[PDB]
Structure formats: C-alpha cells, structure tokens
Amino acid sequence: NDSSSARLFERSRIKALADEREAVQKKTFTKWVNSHLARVTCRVGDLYSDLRDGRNLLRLLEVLSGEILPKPTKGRMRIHCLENVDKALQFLKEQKVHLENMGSHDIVDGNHRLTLGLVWTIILRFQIQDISV
Amino acid sequence: NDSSSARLFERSRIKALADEREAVQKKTFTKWVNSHLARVTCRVGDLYSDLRDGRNLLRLLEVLSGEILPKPTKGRMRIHCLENVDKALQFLKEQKVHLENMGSHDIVDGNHRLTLGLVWTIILRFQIQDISV
Amino acid sequence: MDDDIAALVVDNGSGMCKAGFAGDDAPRAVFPSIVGRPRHQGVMVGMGQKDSYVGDEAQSKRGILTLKYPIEHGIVTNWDDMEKIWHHTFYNELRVAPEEHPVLLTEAPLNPKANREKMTQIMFETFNTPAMYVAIQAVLSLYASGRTTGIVMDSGDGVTHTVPIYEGYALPHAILRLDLAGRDLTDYLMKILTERGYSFTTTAEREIVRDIKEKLCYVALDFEQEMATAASSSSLEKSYELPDGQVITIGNERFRCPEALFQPSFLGMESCGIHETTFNSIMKCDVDIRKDLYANTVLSGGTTMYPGIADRMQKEITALAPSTMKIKIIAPPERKYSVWIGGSILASLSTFQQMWISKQEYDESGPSIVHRKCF
Amino acid sequence: MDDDIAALVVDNGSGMCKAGFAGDDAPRAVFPSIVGRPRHQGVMVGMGQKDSYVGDEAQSKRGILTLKYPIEHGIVTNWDDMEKIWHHTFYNELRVAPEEHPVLLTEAPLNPKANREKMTQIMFETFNTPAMYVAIQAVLSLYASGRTTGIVMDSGDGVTHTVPIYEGYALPHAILRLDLAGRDLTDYLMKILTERGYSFTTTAEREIVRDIKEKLCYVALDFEQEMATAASSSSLEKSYELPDGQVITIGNERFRCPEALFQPSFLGMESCGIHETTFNSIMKCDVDIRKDLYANTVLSGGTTMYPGIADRMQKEITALAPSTMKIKIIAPPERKYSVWIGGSILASLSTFQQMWISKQEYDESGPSIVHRKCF
C-alpha cells in the first residue's frame, strides 16, 4: 500500500521534469529576451531577478511592442514593486495574458514557475498574439 | 410573529407564578420566624420591613443559632443599615449563604425576591445546614 | 411531579436562563446568564462586598461591573460562574434543593463532549441531582410547538439551528447549527452604529444596544429597497433614549442589523442567511419527506423575536425551493420560551420519566452515558 | 506632480499636523494641531490683536492661550479651527493655493460619516480642491513600511489602531481602533505626577509633561519588577527642568505612564493592552494567514515613539499567540511620520492618480462618494 513514499519520489520527479522543462525554457526566454532587451542594452542572466521589479518587464514590453509604458514608483518596498508589475500586468491583460496565477507578487517574489509562467505565456502570446511591435 | 405581546403576558405570568410562590413562601417564613423571633418577642407581619435593618435579621440569627452577633451602628442612613446587614451576611457567609444576589442593600431595600431569596436560602440552610442552635 | 419530585426544567441558553418546575407554563426564573464582577475600586466601609454579582442584579450595576456570559454559544466557558447562575437559579428563583429533583437541562446540539458531561457533573456532584437530563434545544421548542414534522430554526441568543424532523424521526446529518444570533448582531450593531458617532465600548451598553435591537431592529423584508428609501428618512429614523437620558436616532441601522442573520457578509463570513441554511438542510433530506419540511419550517429563539423575519423567509425559500408547492413557516408566540415550555411539558410525559439520567446511573456507570441518553 | 499639480499630503492626525507636497520625503509643515486663544485680558495699545493664534505659535504663548485641539481622536470637533490649522498649513508652510492641488488627506478609520465628508467639504468649498483624498492612517504607514502583509498598529497622538493586511487584502472586521495614545497617557501622567506634589492644571504644561513623557517615559519591558526596583531609586529617578527653571525628579512614574498603553486599568477601562488588541484582531483572522500576522506586526505613530515598546510586544504576544512559530515586530524609524511619508509616495503612483475625489466628482455627485472612494 506504498503510494505515499512513492509520492515523495514521484513528485520529486514531477518537478524534476518540470525543472528540466523550465530551465531550458528559461534559456529559451533568456536568449529570446537578450535578443530584445539588448535594444535597451539590458542583459539577462536571470529572469527571476532582472525582470523582478516589473519595470524591467515593462522595459521588455516597451521593446516587444515598440511602445512606451508608465514607470511608477520603485524602491525597496513591496508596493513599489507591485505597482510596477501592475503596469506590466496592465499591458499584459491588455494583451490578454490572464491572471491565472501570473501575478504582481509572482514577479516581485520571483516565483520560479509563474514568473516564467507569466513570461512564457508572453512568449505564447508574442509569437501567437500582438505583444510584438 | 407575535411573541412580543405574548411576552408581555407570559412574563406577567412568570412572576405571577413566582408571586404565588413567594407569598405563601413568605408566610412559610412568617410563621417560621414568628416561631423563633417570638423568643426575643419580635413579631413579623412583614419580612421586607421588620428584618429590613439587618439587626432584626441579626436577631433571628441570634435566635436560630442561639448565639450573639455584633450590633453595629443603626439609624436613618443607608450605611447604618448596610453595616447591620453586613454583619448578618458575615454570619450567613459563615453559614455559606452565598452572595448570589443575597445582599446587604437587598435587605435594606427590602427586595421582594432577594430578601426572601436570602432568608429562604436561610431556611434551605437551617433545615439543611447548621444555622440552628 | 409539580412541586413533588418535580423535574426542574432549566433552559441554559446563552444570554438568558429560563427555569421552572416541570409542568409550569412560565419559567418563573428568567434572568440573563451573566456574572457581574466589579472593575473600579471603592473605598467605602460597610459596602456590599459582592465580588460576584450574578444574573439580573448585574443588570442593575452595569457601570461598575464586567458583564460576562459564563456560556458561549452553547459551549460553557466558565463552569463555576455557570454554577453561580445555577445556584442562584435554584436558591433565589426556584428556591428549592435540586438534591431531590430531576433537572431537565437544555443544551445546544452538536456540542463538544465536555459540555454535556460536565454540565451534568456539576449538577450531579456540586449539587446533588437524583436524576437529570440535558436536552437539545430545538426539539423542545418543537415540544411546545407540539409537532413532529418539519424543520426547527432555534436562534436563541447565541446559536441559530436548523434541526429537521419527520414524524418523530430526525435527520442528524441534516442538522446545522450556526453562529447568527443576538450576541452577534449587537456586535454588528456596534460597528454600524458608530458611523453616526455613537460608540459603546462597554458590555453594559452592548446589552442596551441589544435592547435597541430587540425593540427597533426588525428584518427588512426586502433589504436594499429599505436602504433605497433610507435616503429620505421619514419613519425609518426613530428616537431612542438612554438610561443617561441622551437621545439616539437610528434610521437604516435598524433593519440591516438583523440582515446579518440573512446576509452574514455584513459580518463577513462564508455563512449564508438562515434561509439558505434550512434550505441546505433540506438538500440533505429525502425526496419523499422534503415536501413536509417546506410547509413546516418552525421558528424559535430570542433572536427570532424580531419583526419581518418570517415573511422574508416565505419569500426567500420560495425563491430557493420548488415554488410549485407551499412553503409555510410556523412562528408561534413565546418562541424564545417555547424551548423551555416544551421541556416543561416533556417532563410531564411518564415515558420521558424513565428517560432520566438517574444519580447512580451517572456515578457508577459513566459521564459518557450522558451521551448515551442525550443525543 | 511635485510642485506641479502636486498632490498635497496633509496628515491631520491628532496632536500634530504633518504636511508636504507629493513625493516629499519630509513633511515640511509639522506643527501641533492646536489653536491658541487668549484667556487673560491685556490693555496695551499696539498689541498683536491675535484673537486666534494657531498651531506652532500657540506653543510660544502657552501661558496666556487656551490650547485646543480642533480634532479629537480622529473625530474633528471644531471645523473652522480645523480650517485655521489648514489655511495656516496651506499658506504659511505649504505656501500655495490648494485651488490647484489635490489634497491627499489622512484620517482615522472607523470614522463617523461627517468626519469624512465635511473634512472633504471644507476643502472642496472653503478652499477649492480640484481633487483630493482623505485616507486611512495605518495603511499609509504601511506604504512607508512598503509592505502588504501583517498588522499595523498606528498609535498617533489620539488613537491606537490594529489594522490587519495580507497581500493587499485587508480584514475590515478585524480592524480595531482604540483610545490609547499620547493624549491619554499625559492625563494619566498628570494624575500620577501629582502624588509627588506636582500639579499642572493647564494645557500649556500638559504638553510639557507630554514632552517629559516623549523623552523620559518609556515602556517597562517587565512592569512590576521595575516597580520593585523603584524602591531603591538609582537610575529610574532623573532630573527634568521646566521652562520656569524649576526641577522635577521622576522615578517609577516614567515607565508606568505608557504602561497604560499595556494595562489600561491604570486609566481604568475595559481596554486591554495594545498587544491583546492586535492579538484580538488575529482572533478574527483566517488560520492560513494568521501566521503572517504574527511575524509582521508593524508599529506606527507618535505614541509608539517610546523605548521598550516593541520588545515587550515580542514578549507578550509570545505569551498570547502560538509560540511554536515566530512573532517578529517591525518598528521602522519615522513611525510617527511613516503615516505621512507613505502617503507622500502614494500620490506618486499613477494608478492612485485615478483614485482621487475630483472637484465635480464631489460637487454634482455627492459627499457620500467620499465614502465610496475612502474606505
């Protein structure tokens, strides 16, 4: 009746297959975003920290769409960061990237599966929908 | 939805059953106390006024226990009366008649349900407990 | 019975105790289940010591005293204070020794197990009780309603219930208790009365705004239209007076306070109004007998004493249940007291007079046989 | 913004007004919310008429003047004097016309409804305000604390709060205001300083013993042991000096004065200390997120400026809450001012710049849309 410890092994391999996905996928995004944020001369060695503020995700959306997005207050504080990603989410819900756990705090916290879960949905609506210029 | 005026009728009959209790019960006490305060030649036509000072309740407890209790200052004033009943309550809490609303001012005011509520608890601790001699 | 052996029926509901002998139509003892304890000090020589005021005298000295329910929503919090309102009940209203009598107690259903066996124990052991029986509230309110079919909604001071029944057979899984009663609505009335600037940060005046509530605060039949005409205050506003002599004016705050019974989001919980809760009980019931639960919704309890309840009920379960058939609600008088009165006639039935937890039945067998007799 | 349209943030807390433009890190205007009015007469030809001294100049002439807060614990008492400290704010510190600016005001939560709509009205109508926003205090102190999770305790000069929050979501039923602040503790300090023989029967010196308090009077971490070593006065006694030049010595009276924050029985109410009040807020909260309220108790306000508060807090909620987990308290600098500073950065956010009560928004629609924007 040993499905429990087998669940401790399986779920470790659930997210092992998801990390083997999300890391190569993060580098798909990484060379994809450094093909774009290099227009504004920003280089990404880490999605989860560079685009963490939201304003840097705003820089990406200003590159991809070739447009301008508002840059509200930023600093140390949480509200500083959440507002910035709430403008990114303003343009991303404008681009119909839903709030299916693709969040403000998810970018601020750098949530490994939803920061990439947001911006890979940005890839799945850049080469599908008009996040491009 | 007429439980309200029915409450004006019911509560009148709540305390009607309680007055049919407490009056016959007051006469249970009355012939009981005039079987005792007649030893000190005090006659009770009204619990609520004769034993109102506390010193007269002290006379009863001096009869029942066959003992002597202190007689502090008495007069017109409230403190005069409250002190006297506070000696009665001294001997009655000595006899474990609690202060569950069986009070100094309850005897001084002559509260119909707690003056008898005190001294009926005195009956319920005379023929149960050693308020007797 | 009846001043003989004479089972004492003592409804220990929250907010109010209601006690009398068996067979009595009126609980001679009614007084708030409170214990008054002084807050400020007093240097006066010859003053009632009175550490523990209890019950209705604490209504007299509400300023000095910390008013405190020993029970909370059927769950007994303070057991010796519970024994204070008991011993005051038995020696200052019932004025008799329980050492002779059975004590037909009343308690809320779906009770954690200590509040049955200890509620019985302090009777058996601190008092003596040659017999006794703690009892479910809503069924005894059905005993004064005197029926066997429908669903009883007993909102006392602490707990609203929805207890179904069908010809003597209850449906336990469909029984639902809920915390929506007079103790809750006065907290909502507290937070909603201070928007006019009236703060009452003392339990003394919590009972006074509960008194406002038990007079003024009815149930809006339709709610937001009474709030729509709360724009033009014509009759919804009324003057109340304090024991200090000050005047209140309350308008919309009247009907919306017991709307928390019906929209507990005004309190802010998951809880649906009482009409969805009885409706949710009948979800759990059997399609043959669900018809007889609609036409026989019974009301009970002290919070159910308010105007505009039962017609909102017939409106709203009509919105919920199959309106093809009939949804009558049966709201008798004395619904706060029907809980007690039906107990005062329960002890009269001699078949119940073998259903007592006798003394040695408690002592040698268990405190868990309380649960074997009371369920 | 920022000397342009430039939302004026004006923290109208009791005791002190704190005002500056949007984006300012420092409220250039800080001065006591007082109005000085002369008591004794003066026959001198050529003397400042000055019927109504206002604000910080009344600190200069405290002897002649009747010092008077126009606001009381968030509740605005005197509206024209409120407009005196306003018009002085806007023309002698901010030195500008509100006729152009939004005015980001700050107000206490759980406010009776006139103190929002009239606080806005005298802005809209006596002044002109093309836009404005009255605002809850503790949230804006969380804006300078810059977080979204925990519970904020803003004890300004008049009101202590306990305002919970969890990732932007507040719990309104768990919000609790309370009258335990610097205005109260100086009355307790008044009644407890005169046992040494020092009576100060004038508001002039009520602020001076409040100044004693805001310097000397810390919070006993443990109380009755500091009173136990108040037997042998070694360091607890210290010399203070008056503006007259006289000397005070206070020993135990130091720590016990803000103990009334923690044991309001020293004042003599029902009220528990501030630690039981935040703990009582977390009683009303949700078991998933109650953990994040423990480790993120935030401090704010001018009465919270005292030593020994926050370590007594971590000691005592440890005594109250599950000590299995962690109870960190976050007490940033400028906690009196964080209320204002977080507002001065709130107006900077352009999403907030659509959340203004504009002019015609007030005029044609209502004064009740103030309540629709400010809650």
Short mmCIF file of C-alpha atoms in Angstrom, two decimals, chain A residues 70 72-74 76-80 82-83 86-87 90 104-105 109, chain D residues 139 142-149 167 345 348-352 354:
data_model
loop_
_atom_site.label_atom_id
_atom_site.label_comp_id
_atom_site.label_asym_id
_atom_site.label_seq_id
_atom_site.Cartn_x
_atom_site.Cartn_y
_atom_site.Cartn_z
CA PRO A 70 4.25 54.13 -17.46
CA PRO A 72 5.51 54.28 -11.47
CA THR A 73 7.31 54.48 -8.15
CA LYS A 74 10.07 51.95 -7.42
CA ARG A 76 12.99 48.82 -1.65
CA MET A 77 9.38 48.40 -0.64
CA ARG A 78 6.85 45.82 -1.81
CA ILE A 79 4.25 48.34 -3.04
CA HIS A 80 6.97 49.95 -5.13
CA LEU A 82 3.83 45.53 -7.09
CA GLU A 83 2.77 48.79 -8.72
CA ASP A 86 0.72 46.11 -12.04
CA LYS A 87 1.55 48.31 -15.00
CA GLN A 90 -1.94 46.35 -17.22
CA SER A 104 2.29 41.03 -9.46
CA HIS A 105 3.86 39.41 -6.41
CA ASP A 109 8.82 37.30 -5.38
CA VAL D 139 -2.30 51.72 5.53
CA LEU D 142 2.34 50.60 5.65
CA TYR D 143 3.07 52.47 2.42
CA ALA D 144 6.19 53.92 4.03
CA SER D 145 6.77 50.49 5.57
CA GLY D 146 6.04 49.49 2.00
CA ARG D 147 4.64 46.05 2.71
CA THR D 148 1.34 44.25 2.17
CA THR D 149 1.30 41.53 4.85
CA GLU D 167 -1.06 40.75 0.29
CA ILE D 345 4.69 58.22 -2.05
CA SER D 348 3.34 59.33 -6.75
CA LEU D 349 1.71 56.12 -8.01
CA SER D 350 -0.23 56.92 -11.16
CA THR D 351 -2.84 54.23 -10.51
CA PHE D 352 -3.62 56.16 -7.35
CA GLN D 354 -7.04 58.00 -10.93
#
